[PDB]
Amino acid sequence: TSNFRVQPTESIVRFPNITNLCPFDEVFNATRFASVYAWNRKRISNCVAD
Amino acid sequence: TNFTISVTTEILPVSMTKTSVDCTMYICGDSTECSNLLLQYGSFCTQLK
Ligand SMILES: *[C@@H]1O[C@H](CO)[C@@H](O[C@@H]2O[C@H](CO)[C@@H](O)[C@H](O)[C@H]2NC(C)=O)[C@H](O)[C@H]1NC(C)=O
Ligand SMILES: *[C@@H]1O[C@H](CO)[C@@H](O)[C@H](O)[C@H]1NC(C)=O
Ligand SMILES: *[C@@H]1O[C@H](CO)[C@@H](O)[C@H](O)[C@H]1NC(C)=O
C-alpha cells in the first residue's frame, strides 16, 4: 500500500555564531554615496546576516 | 568400431533479483507537496506497482 519513512532525527540547528560586528552600518549610513556609472564595491562577510 | 564418451555443458539463466521502489520517494523524496501534486497527475505509480 504505502512506504514508511526513516524519521531522520530531530532538526539540528548549526553553530555559525561569531562576532556580530558588520560593515553594514557605515555603508548604509553616509552623507555621500557613489555615482551610478562608478559604484563602490564592498565584500561583506565574516559576520552575521543582519 | 569404438565408443567415445561425450558430454557438453549448457548455461541457462532462470530469474533475476526482483526490485520494488516506491515512486514518491524515488522521484519527489520526502516532499509532501510533490506527492500532492502527483496525486492528480495520474495513476502511473499504481501501474508501476
Ligand atoms: C577404445 O579406445 C579406448 C581408448 O584408447 C580404449 O581404451 C584403452 O584400452 C586399453 C586396453 O584395452 C588400455 O590399456 C588403455 O589404458 C585404454 N585407454 C583409455 C583412455 O581408456 C578401448 O580399449 C578401445 N575399445 C576397444 C574395443 O578396443
Ligand atoms: C557562539 O557564542 C558563544 C558565546 O559567545 C561562544 O562561546 C561560541 O564559541 C560561539 N560559537 C562559535 C562557533 O564560535
Ligand atoms: C546611521 O546614521 C546616523 C547619521 O546619519 C549615524 O549617527 C548612526 O551612527 C548610523 N547608524 C545607526 C545604527 O544609527
Asked if the C-beta of B36 comes within 8 angstroms of chain A's C-beta atoms, the answer is no
Q: What is the resolution of this structure in A?
A: 6.0
| Neighbour count for residue B5 (Cβ, 10 Å) | 4
How many interchain CB pairs under 8 A, A with B?
A: 6
**Which residues 6+ apart lie within 8 Å of A2 measured at CB?**
B22
For this PDB entry, the determination method is cryo-EM
Among residues A18, A11, A12, A26, the alpha carbon closest in space to that of A49 is found at: A18
DSSP 8-state code for residue A39: -
Contact B24, B49 (CB under 8 A): no
C-alpha cell at B8: 557438453
What is the longest distance spanned by two Cα atoms in chain A?
A: 67
Q: How far is the CA of A29 from the centre of ligand 3 (A)?
A: 6
Nearest to A18 by CA among A40, A46, A49, A50: A46
Task: Inform me whether the C-beta atom of residue B30 falls under 8 Å from chain A C-beta atoms.
Answer: yes
Candidates B45, B42, B38, B1; CA nearest to B23 is B45
d(CA A12, CA B48): 36
Residue B27, amino acid: I
Q: What cell numbers appear for B19 in the block?
A: 526490485
